[PDB]
Design a protein around this ligand. Structure first.
Ligand SMILES: CC1=C(/C=C/C(C)=C/C=C/C(C)=C/C=C/C=C(C)/C=C/C=C(C)/C=C/C2=C(C)C(=O)CCC2(C)C)C(C)(C)CCC1=O
Length: 137
């Protein structure tokens, strides 16, 4: 199911992908950054609208300096980066998702599948979910 889940995730639109990994992040709680630390500080320094745009840019695979930087990182550093962004959003340092937002049926189906996998399999899916975000020419 891991390759199938990765494949389906890759078909979701950017909004669904980004929403899914947010809710995946929140679920983990119920259970070092190498050269990415600076990028996190850059995002913390942006205003709320620009922070949201930055994260949307990554999921949309837009051509921006942050997206090019992101693309150069290892898979585990990309994961750690998103984890830290999640923490920062929870803490109020980075703009939160829209209030009252509901995960689409399509995204929910994928999230439900992920939650049924073994923990290692879940991380494999999430690692592959974020590895091709940002920009490659
Ligand atoms: C604007 C806007 C939105 C906004 C959406 C937004 C802003 C969404 C933001 C979503 C974010 C910030 C999601 C973060 C997810 C992080 C995960 C799952 C991390 C996993 C890490 C792992 C497994 C780490 C593992 C590891 C650790 C810890 C190590 O330390 C090393 C080991 C290892 C590698 C195994 C919406 C899309 C909702 C609506 C539309 C709309 O307009």
């Amino acid at each position: 199911m891991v390759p199938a889940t990765i494949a389906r995730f890759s078909q979701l639109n950017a909004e669904d992908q980004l929403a899914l990994i947010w809710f995946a992040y929140l679920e983990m709680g119920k259970t070092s950054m190498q050269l990415a630390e600076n990028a996190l500080k850059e995002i913390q320094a942006m205003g709320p609208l620009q922070q949201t745009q930055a994260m949307c840019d990554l999921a949309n695979r837009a051509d921006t300096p942050l997206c090019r930087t992101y693309a150069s990182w290892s898979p585990n550093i990309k994961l750690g980066f998103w984890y830290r962004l999640g923490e920062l959003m929870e803490q109020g340092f980075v703009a939160p998702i829209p209030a009252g937002y509901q995960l689409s049926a399509n995204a929910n189906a994928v999230l439900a599948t992920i939650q049924g996998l073994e923990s290692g399999q879940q991380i494999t899916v999430l690692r592959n979910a974020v590895v091709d975000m940002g920009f490659t020419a």
